Design a protein around this ligand. Structure first.
Ligand SMILES: *C/C=C(C)/C=C/C=C(C)/C=C/C1=C(C)CCCC1(C)C
Ligand SMILES: *C/C=C(C)/C=C/C=C(C)/C=C/C1=C(C)CCCC1(C)C
Ligand SMILES: *C/C=C(C)/C=C/C=C(C)/C=C/C1=C(C)CCCC1(C)C
Ligand SMILES: CCCCCCCC/C=C/CCCCCCCC(=O)O
Ligand SMILES: CCCCCCCC/C=C\CCCCCCCC(=O)O
Ligand SMILES: CCCCCCCC/C=C\CCCCCCCC(=O)O
Ligand SMILES: CCCCCCCC/C=C\CCCCCCCC(=O)O
Ligand SMILES: CCCCCCCC/C=C\CCCCCCCC(=O)O
Ligand SMILES: CCCCCCCC/C=C\CCCCCCCC(=O)O
Ligand SMILES: CCCCCCCC/C=C\CCCCCCCC(=O)O
Ligand SMILES: CCCCCCCC/C=C\CCCCCCCC(=O)O
Ligand SMILES: CCCCCCCC/C=C\CCCCCCCC(=O)O
Ligand SMILES: CCCCCCCC/C=C\CCCCCCCC(=O)O
Ligand SMILES: CCCCCCCC/C=C\CCCCCCCC(=O)O
Ligand SMILES: CCCCCCCC/C=C\CCCCCCCC(=O)O
Ligand SMILES: CCCCCCCC/C=C\CCCCCCCC(=O)O
Ligand SMILES: CCCCCCCC/C=C\CCCCCCCC(=O)O
Ligand SMILES: CCCCCCCC/C=C\CCCCCCCC(=O)O
Ligand SMILES: CCCCCCCC/C=C\CCCCCCCC(=O)O
Ligand SMILES: CCCCCCCC/C=C\CCCCCCCC(=O)O
Ligand SMILES: CCCCCCCC/C=C\CCCCCCCC(=O)O
Ligand SMILES: CCCCCCCC/C=C\CCCCCCCC(=O)O
Ligand SMILES: CCCCCCCC/C=C\CCCCCCCC(=O)O
Ligand SMILES: [Cl-]
Ligand SMILES: [Cl-]
Ligand SMILES: [Cl-]
Lengths: 253, 255, 252
């Protein structure tokens, strides 16, 4: 995997993604080390691996090792799609865990369907990104990926929201708070695809890479601390032990 | 991923897989929304993602984006094997939860071993499909894949069947009714590989693709609706609630 | 996937890995059949699939169908990295199952992070192996992979060890027993990477493939029977039933 040449402006935006995800992961690891309940531990570990994998994929892209040449000649950062397949289910799992508790006590096949529809969304998106410009198959997969996105929206706004009301009041508030912010940020992703050089090409590759970088920092770092502070607040309102799970394990032995 | 040329008769068989898997997945999604028990919901979304993933892989193949050329020169539809790795464990998951209930509360290692033996089968079958024609590497991996196939057969007819009767008489009948149909349909897959153009070459790639298409429609759409109506009759027999899972969550969430 | 020829001395070491992983997997399947408790059955089939997948990857490498030509010109056995991504989490699953029991009823995200950090380690190690020799990118991913290794060592020596003490004295004794032997053997893998032909190049591709074979044989076959013997001894001290789980299912 010899490093590939990148435009200076594009590589600069990728290094902003590296430094952003690295710092956010370090702070998010603190929420892991200080988790007090299984719900707080699951949410913390999920968010941390979102940032940690995102740091790796931006390091791969910045080092010129996360892109290849499509058949039409464009440069597609496939590493971004590869890790999106793993980070975006962890984000959605956080929503489903908020709505159904940790460990998941009910409606597990709707959680698996959430992850499944999301993984399909990314994978069919990669195919649309690798399809040649101006081709019908490029937008057939775009509409296929958008249909998976619509089903993720439906599960978040329909079944999973119905179960949030069943779980509890504070779980319903946190879920609605986190599901709304996530849904607004994620909506801009197909907009960048449609207008970036992975689609209609209204703006070039550097702008496309920059917007994806800012969206990734928003959906992972900014939203992650937005969500992990709501988890911590819910765990405070729920009256959690003033003890980490590790400290509770040390005293139980 | 620019579309690669495909023989017209082969492309025609791929589209009948697209139309069949697309209509089957839409109908199966109704079984998901109508689910009333955890067992009914687990079985429903499993079959739905079986049909849904099969739709996309036949779409990819029909669009000329689901195959590559092996080093020996043949055209291999690798997309089929790629999604087979995910749709065939979901089918067997349905058998596992029919024998052990949903959620699976015991014998999880035998379910993971079932899924694992199945993934090894498809993955090693891909290597045999990409190995050269008339080589020994092809039939070693064909032999390895057949070994994992026998492991699947043993787990279905052995420990899982022994566990089905422990769950109950209704779960035993459903399991034995669906496992027999599934096992008869799945046996024809290695026969097609053996005689198709990714094996000995009794028939060409068009006939091979056609047989795989029909076998996929049978094992996924035909068997899927055969199976999922069995799990609905089981819930009806056991007195299932008059409310779906969503409607039950709406009652317990409304005020 | 047409086979690419290998050095006969290298292919010889690969075929001894096929023979070793096959022989261990057949015996380990006998432990699967004899499983008496859900804990004993979880460890058995986990260790079995470790040997089985290792048999297939050495078969793929021995047949000349599991290597790659990196951009810099070297030959990398990517099949080994591909299956490492699956077998190494199963090994740590055994330790995690030893510490928390089967099924895992608590601290599930610490097992997922254990698996997650181990996967990142093998994947970033593969990227390090494919990166050109004598380049900064290779050793950037080597350090990144080494950091994921230290996370694995931290979780094993940290929260999992504390949780093994909570599960019971027999599980804590078995956990420390298998965790120390696993940790010592795994430490030798980055040593072979650093000094082998996918690193500094102290020795060529033949010695690197031979050491990985010996290391895989030791960490999977030798350790696997060392671990599964402690698993059966643990359930033996627990007075485990003389019935297998399948025999219990037939009677019930
Ligand atoms: C951290 C990464 C995140 C939150 C990624 C989000 C990606 C999406 C919501 C996907 C968007 C796409 C479509 C719905 C259509 C095709 C193009 C994609 C993949 C950008
Ligand atoms: C929907 C797809 C299904 C049910 C796939 C079934 C595939 C098999 C049962 C596998 C067959 C193979 C062998 C047992 C040996 C090697 C060739 C294969 C992969 C066709
Ligand atoms: C059966 C296979 C086993 C136990 C593999 C273990 C592999 C490791 C502990 C990984 C070692 C690596 C590093 C820590 C840094 C980069 C090079 C690696 C991948 C060999
Ligand atoms: C270049 C040297 C620095 C290394 C770069 C980053 C290395 C990646 C390290 C892995 C972090 C994994 C932490 C997982 C612990 C989870 C805690 C838990 O689950 O309770
Ligand atoms: C420290 C945590 C690291 C997390 C995992 C790292 C994620 C990136 C991993 C490697 C992605 C490589 C993608 C390259 C695909 C082929 C394109 C090419 O290089 O030619
Ligand atoms: C290449 C396409 C990849 C798609 C990945 C799909 C991920 C799995 C899809 C959904 C599985 C849903 C099955 C429900 C599991 C219920 C668990 C149970 O109770 O048994
Ligand atoms: C050219 C445009 C083609 C349009 C194709 C439409 C794509 C539909 C995508 C699949 C949605 C599947 C997800 C359904 C939710 C699962 C239900 C559940 O888990 O409970
Ligand atoms: C946007 C959500 C609905 C999904 C619809 C899928 C495709 C239509 C959306 C954008 C495509 C833009 C117009 C391009 C059509 C083909 C013209 C071309 O080949 O360049
Ligand atoms: C042109 C591409 C876009 C076309 C619109 C596609 C619409 C598909 C949207 C998803 C439907 C999801 C319904 C799933 C029902 C789940 C049942 C449940 O478990 O509650
Ligand atoms: C949410 C998006 C808001 C609007 C953002 C618009 C961005 C426009 C930026 C400049 C357009 C041209 C981009 C220059 C990149 C050239 C690189 C290339 O073409 O390969
Ligand atoms: C609430 C969600 C917020 C999402 C933030 C990301 C959306 C807006 C992103 C920035 C728009 C402008 C992009 C920068 C263009 C200049 C890049 C360049 O061409 O050099
Ligand atoms: C580091 C770059 C950040 C880019 C913008 C981040 C996008 C916004 C992310 C979420 C922050 C929350 C925004 C406002 C919360 C409103 C609360 C509510 O919805 O009730
Ligand atoms: C089971 C439902 C089946 C649905 C009907 C499927 C119809 C398939 C028909 C042929 C597909 C097109 C074949 C490609 C030929 C293109 C050559 C040309 O147009 O010149
Ligand atoms: C959203 C509804 C449809 C679901 C689609 C998701 C299922 C799988 C999608 C397509 C898989 C494509 C894999 C083919 C890549 C082969 C590589 C190649 O030929 O170059
Ligand atoms: C007909 C040729 C046979 C070749 C034999 C060699 C191939 C072996 C293939 C995989 C064996 C899979 C074993 C899986 C059973 C697991 C046991 C369990 O989970 O309880
Ligand atoms: C205990 C093992 C039971 C299984 C027995 C079947 C194993 C078959 C072994 C492989 C035969 C491969 C033949 C390759 C011939 C190579 C000769 C050459 O060209 O150099
Ligand atoms: C080669 C096989 C092609 C398969 C495609 C045709 C689809 C199969 C049609 C329906 C199968 C229904 C199976 C069980 C019927 C249940 C109806 C009922 O309960 O009354
Ligand atoms: C051509 C591929 C699509 C095939 C569609 C097959 C349609 C099968 C529809 C369901 C018929 C069964 C009615 C629902 C279950 C009733 C049986 C029962 O509850 O006991
Ligand atoms: C160096 C070439 C070796 C050739 C193969 C050697 C085979 C014998 C090796 C040891 C296997 C021991 C298996 C233990 C049998 C357990 C039987 C029991 O008590 O249930
Ligand atoms: C019983 C067997 C179980 C193990 C199955 C897995 C065996 C190994 C799987 C595939 C290894 C493929 C290695 C990559 C091939 C590179 C050749 C190339 O395409 O250039
Ligand atoms: C090349 C990939 C081959 C397939 C990889 C997947 C194989 C996994 C096999 C199953 C081992 C799992 C053992 C069951 C442990 C669960 C019970 C527990 O966690 O306590
Ligand atoms: C290509 C990058 C590969 C990344 C490896 C896989 C990453 C897995 C990371 C950890 C999984 C998230 C842990 C969350 C625990 C949830 C369990 C629960 O429901 O309580
Ligand atoms: C120069 C220093 C290099 C350091 C490399 C990276 C070190 C990583 C070490 C392990 C990090 C583990 C973090 C886990 C947090 C606590 C987990 C818990 O017990 O809940
Ligand atoms: Cl990512
Ligand atoms: Cl499929
Ligand atoms: Cl391995």
């Amino acid at each position: 995997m010899n490093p590939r040449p990148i435009e200076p402006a594009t590589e600069a935006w990728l290094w902003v993604g590296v430094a952003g995800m690295a710092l956010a992961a370090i702070v998010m690891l603190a929420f892991v080390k200080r988790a007090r309940t299984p719900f707080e531990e699951s949410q913390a570990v999920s968010q941390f691996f979102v940032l940690l994998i995102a740091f790796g994929t931006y390091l791969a892209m910045a080092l010129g090792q996360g892109s290849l040449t499509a058949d039409d000649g464009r440069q597609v950062f496939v590493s971004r799609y590869i890790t999106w397949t793993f980070t975006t289910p962890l984000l959605l799992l956080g929503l489903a865990t908020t709505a159904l508790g940790s460990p998941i006590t009910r409606r597990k096949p709707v959680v698996a369907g959430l992850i499944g529809a999301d993984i399909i969304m990314i994978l069919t998106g990669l195919v649309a990104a690798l399809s040649p410009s101006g081709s019908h198959e490029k937008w057939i997969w775009y509409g296929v990926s958008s249909g998976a996105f619509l089903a993720v929206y439906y599960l978040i706004c329909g079944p999973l929201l119905l179960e949030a009301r069943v779980t509890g009041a504070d779980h319903r508030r946190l879920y609605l708070r986190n599901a709304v912010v996530l849904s607004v940020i994620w909506f801009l992703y197909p907009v960048n695809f449609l207008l970036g050089n992975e689609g209609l090409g209204q703006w070039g590759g550097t702008a496309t890479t920059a917007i994806y970088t800012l969206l990734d920092l928003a959906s992972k770092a900014a939203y992650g601390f937005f969500a992990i502070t709501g988890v911590r607040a819910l765990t405070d309102r729920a009256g959690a032990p003033a003890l980490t799970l590790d400290e509770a394990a040390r005293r139980a032995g």
